[PDB]
């Protein structure tokens, strides 16, 4: 149901920003700091956005909420060298982001 669906998604989310490697999608990456950050990374998402987006009732579904998650995983992976901290913080939300989605699931 849209109500059991947006539970799961606010548990995930919480999940999510409390995790060890959450410490780089906390907040928008601001362009003004990044100079070419918005030139690389059209379409820009972090965790502070898809909880607004939530609390407000901007998700229909879980996979749309999902796509936002995604979204964040594909830009760090876009714009972060792999080897870098952040690039690999990336990468471990990714995984877990997706072994909480599945298992549920
Ligand atoms: C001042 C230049 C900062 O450069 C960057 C470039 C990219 N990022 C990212 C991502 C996801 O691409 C994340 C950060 C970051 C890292 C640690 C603390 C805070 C931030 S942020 C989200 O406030 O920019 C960060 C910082």
């Given at each position: 149901s849209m109500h059991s669906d947006l539970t799961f998604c606010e548990i995930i989310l919480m999940?999510?920003?409390?995790?060890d490697a959450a410490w780089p999608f906390l907040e928008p990456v601001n362009p003004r700091?990044?100079?070419?950050?918005?030139?690389?990374?059209?379409?820009?998402?972090?965790?502070?956005?898809?909880?607004?987006?939530?609390?407000?009732?901007?998700?229909?579904?879980?996979?749309?909420?999902?796509?936002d998650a995604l979204l964040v995983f594909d830009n760090c992976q876009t714009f972060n060298e792999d080897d870098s901290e952040v690039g690999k913080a990336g990468h471990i939300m990714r995984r877990f982001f997706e072994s909480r989605w599945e298992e549920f699931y």
């Open positions: 999940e999510m920003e409390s995790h700091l990044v100079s070419g950050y918005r030139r690389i990374i059209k379409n820009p998402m972090d965790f502070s956005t898809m909880r607004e987006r939530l609390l407000r009732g901007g998700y229909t579904s879980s996979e749309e909420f999902a796509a």
